[PDB]
Ligand binder design. Structure first.
Ligand SMILES: O=C1CCCC2=C1C1(CCCCC1)N=C(Nc1nc3ccccc3o1)N2
Ligand SMILES: OC[C@H]1O[C@@H](O)[C@H](O)[C@@H](O)[C@H]1O
Length: 388
């Protein structure tokens, strides 16, 4: 049908071949870092909240080798990457720092190099490949940040923590792609484990690895194959408004705010205000309940909090789009379905029975106005290394 298979052995082989042809020698190491599906807990991470993502078999691979000349040489073979496919630059120094610009895909590699905390960092040659659909809502940018970071650790081991590394990747996203993201996508790309979701507490940075084994249960990802303008533009506006709802209430972070409060603080902030917040906490409490639900094997409560998630994202947070609303209507003929990631396009996430996947993909395709692409996703490992 329209099911893209991951083909990860091929993705590594692709990268190795292209490296031999481009640089005239076999690459000395491989790394990978996954993209992600957020099962529930949307627009909670920057509100010091809870999220429940899993890592995908869709990943970004770097194969490469240290250089002696203190410069970086990159080739990407990702169809979708903006021109040129290649970029070279000297390492940053105290005097001269990397700058974002053209092409954009390189800015993610540049950002991570610029903020890498350990030394001495040598130059390197690398091929970048990704099966993560570029800008399609499954954290292609976080997978490339964390794949870069994982490569730099092989060049110059950091003696650091998982949060410090997520924070570097996150800073590359802020400074070099101008995207003021939370920590979710980096965190899951670092910490995912095969057969688990990851409950992340973005206040404490405590992490729980939640078994997601049962073969009766499947996660269908549907790419709408739209990105609307409002995406780039509205994400920071939402963030900014969330800081205002906490500006008053005297709550550093919304996490520190319960729903009895927002109901009783109605008309100490905007109606745009009360909205957005109803969502967040709706969504924090749904993710806590969702986590608990997933431990008990209680799919219907989780899958009903998931449909409850979508409704709140669509009506209260106003970061759905008709394409998302229709992809779920279609699927929700499944425990549940909802947008995942930032919204304004990208993917839905459908929790269906494995038996019913062949028919879901008949129906979604035949009842979606747009072009649907499908991933049938096992919960995957995070950042990995293979010495070659
Ligand atoms: O234009 C946008 C809109 C904002 C979201 C977004 C981008 C682009 C970056 C420039 C070229 C394609 C689109 N790329 C990503 N992520 C990404 N680009 C990669 C290149 C190679 C390997 C893995 C990659 O992941 N995200
Ligand atoms: O659930 C909303 C999410 O949007 C993602 O795309 C962003 O990178 C995350 O940090 C988080 O804010």
């Amino acid at each position: 049908a329209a099911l893209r298979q991951p083909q990860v052995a091929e993705l590594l082989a692709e990268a190795r071949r292209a490296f031999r042809e481009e640089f005239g020698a076999e690459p000395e190491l491989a790394v990978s870092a996954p993209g992600r599906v957020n099962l529930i807990g949307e627009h909670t991470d920057y509100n010091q909240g809870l999220v429940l993502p899993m890592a995908l078999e869709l990943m970004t691979v770097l194969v490469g080798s240290p250089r002696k000349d203190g410069l970086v040489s990159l080739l990407t073979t990702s169809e979708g990457a903006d021109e040129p496919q290649r970029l070279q630059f000297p390492l940053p120094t105290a005097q001269r720092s990397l700058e974002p610009g053209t092409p954009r895909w390189a800015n993610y590699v540049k950002g991570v190099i610029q903020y890498y905390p350990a030394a001495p960092l040598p130059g390197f040659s690398a091929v970048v490949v990704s099966s993560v659909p570029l800008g399609g809502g499954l954290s292609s940018s976080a997978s490339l940040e964390v794949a870069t970071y994982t490569f730099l650790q092989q060049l110059c081991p950091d003696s650091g923590t998982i949060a410090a590394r997520a924070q570097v990747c996150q800073q590359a996203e802020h400074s070099f792609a101008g995207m003021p993201c939370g920590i979710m996508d980096q965190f899951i790309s670092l910490m995912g484990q095969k057969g688990h979701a990851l409950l992340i507490d973005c206040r404490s940075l405590e992490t729980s690895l939640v078994p997601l084994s049962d073969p009766k249960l499947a996660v269908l990802i549907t790419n709408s194959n739209v990105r609307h303008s409002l995406a780039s533009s509205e994400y920071p506006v939402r963030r900014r408004q969330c800081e205002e709802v906490a500006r008053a209430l005297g709550a550093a972070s919304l996490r520190e705010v319960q729903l009895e409060e927002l109901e009783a603080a109605r008309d100490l902030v905007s109606k745009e205000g009360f909205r957005r917040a109803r969502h967040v906490v709706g969504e924090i409490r749904r993710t806590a309940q969702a986590a608990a639900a997933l431990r008990r094997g209680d799919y219907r409560a989780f899958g009903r909090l998931m449909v409850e998630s979508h409704r709140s994202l669509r009506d209260d947070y106003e970061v759905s789009c008709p394409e998302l609303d229709q992809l779920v209507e279609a699927a929700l003929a499944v425990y549940g379905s909802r947008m995942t990631g930032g919204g304004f396009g990208g993917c839905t996430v459908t929790l269906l029975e494995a038996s019913a996947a062949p028919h879901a993909m008949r129906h979604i395709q035949e009842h979606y106005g747009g072009t649907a692409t499908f991933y049938l996703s096992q919960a995957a490992d995070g950042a990995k290394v293979l010495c070659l």
